[PDB]
Design a binder for this molecule. Structure first.
Ligand SMILES: CN1CCN(c2ccc([N+](=O)[O-])cc2Nc2nccc3ccccc23)CC1
Ligand SMILES: O=C(O)c1c(O)c(NS(=O)(=O)c2cc(Br)ccc2O)cc(C2CC2)c1F
Length: 304
């Protein structure tokens, strides 16, 4: 019926705003990125600091894991993405091509491709092995806030301040669908649902929406949080009860019932905007991260 997330660890170390936290697919690690130009690795279960990964010349907006939990990609204000070997901390490739800040990144399930989105209004598809750009998609007419592959990597979804969500065919780069609302507020986050059927989209009018993309119909709306300024990540919680999880500009983590849309928990503790949340792949564990009045990551655990 309702979760009971309680605070287990506060992870200190970043010296500026923390922008993104991600659990490794095998559940072992949490990776964090920050405006301090650093990536940090932490134990997912004991919160123990593991290592700092350094090399970007400016701040980092996003990080993402390969499917074997061995590689990381990061997206930076220095206009590059970097591919990292987590075990060695070494930069394997620097992905060059974007003409402005890179805001978002993800591997496909095979992890032979990386997708990125940028202030430069493009979505790029990269070959992991060579580090070369395979395709540049003229995806949007304002900064791209999020990019995500579906279950098998055959589709990409992108979101933008231009107010649009777009679905792309990975192999051809052609646009398969454009989702439009009405009053087109900036779309600040998007991701495919666990079953690949739906898309979860945030707009900067304090609203999360679950869309059936093949029918182009909104199925659920989640409200009550604050989101009018920052691109705040959202998640599906798949380990216990079926929840939607998001940060909020009132410094709280919000948790909603997937089907009824009622708020079932609000997690208090952070002292700045909670810009990023992540849900552990097997354990009812949430990671949250906040902006520069806070600079910490928090790990929470629920019985359901
Ligand atoms: C995981 N997310 C984090 C937010 N990302 C993002 C998206 C659009 C814009 N944009 O359009 O400006 C900026 C950012 N980055 C940051 N936004 C706010 C505060 C930040 C603080 C430090 C580093 C990056 C920050 C996308 C991926
Ligand atoms: O009762 C359900 O199992 C169910 C459902 O599984 C999906 N699929 S999902 O991909 O959003 C999803 C979300 C989560 Br959290 C976990 C798994 C998952 O598969 C959607 C809906 C309603 C909202 C439309 C459901 F009621």
């Amino acid at each position: 019926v309702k979760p009971n997330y309680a605070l287990k660890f506060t992870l200190a170390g970043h010296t500026k705003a923390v922008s993104s936290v991600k659990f490794s697919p095998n559940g072992e690690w949490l990776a964090s990125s920050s405006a301090d130009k650093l990536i940090k690795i932490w134990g997912a279960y004991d919160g123990k600091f593991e290592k700092t990964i350094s090399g970007h010349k400016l701040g980092i907006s996003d990080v993402a894991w390969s499917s074997d939990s061995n590689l990381l990609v990061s997206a930076s204000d220095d206009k590059t993405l970097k591919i990292w070997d987590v075990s060695s901390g070494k930069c394997l490739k620097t992905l060059k091509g974007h003409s402005n800040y890179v805001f978002c990144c993800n591997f496909n399930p095979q992890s032979n491709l990386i997708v990125s989105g940028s202030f430069d209004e493009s979505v790029r598809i990269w070959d992991v092995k060579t580090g070369k750009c395979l395709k540049t998609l003229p995806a949007h007419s304002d900064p791209v806030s999020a990019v995500h592959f579906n279950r098998d990597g055959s589709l990409i979804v992108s979101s933008s301040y231009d107010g649009l969500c777009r679905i792309w065919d990975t192999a051809s780069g052609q646009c398969l669908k454009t989702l439009i609302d009405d009053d087109n507020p900036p779309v600040s986050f998007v991701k495919f649902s666990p079953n690949g059927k739906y898309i979860l989209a945030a707009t900067l009018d304090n609203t999360l929406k679950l869309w059936d993309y093949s029918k182009g119909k909104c199925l659920k709306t989640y409200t009550g949080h604050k989101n009018e300024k920052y691109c705040i990540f959202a998640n599906f919680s798949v380990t216990g009860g079926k929840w939607i999880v998001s940060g909020s500009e009132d410094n709280l983590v919000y948790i909603w019932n997937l089907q009824t849309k009622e708020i079932v928990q609000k997690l208090q503790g952070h002292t700045d905007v909670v810009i990023s949340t992540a849900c552990h792949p097997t354990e009812n564990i949430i990671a949250s991260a906040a902006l520069e009045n806070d600079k910490t990551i928090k790990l929470w655990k629920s019985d359901c």
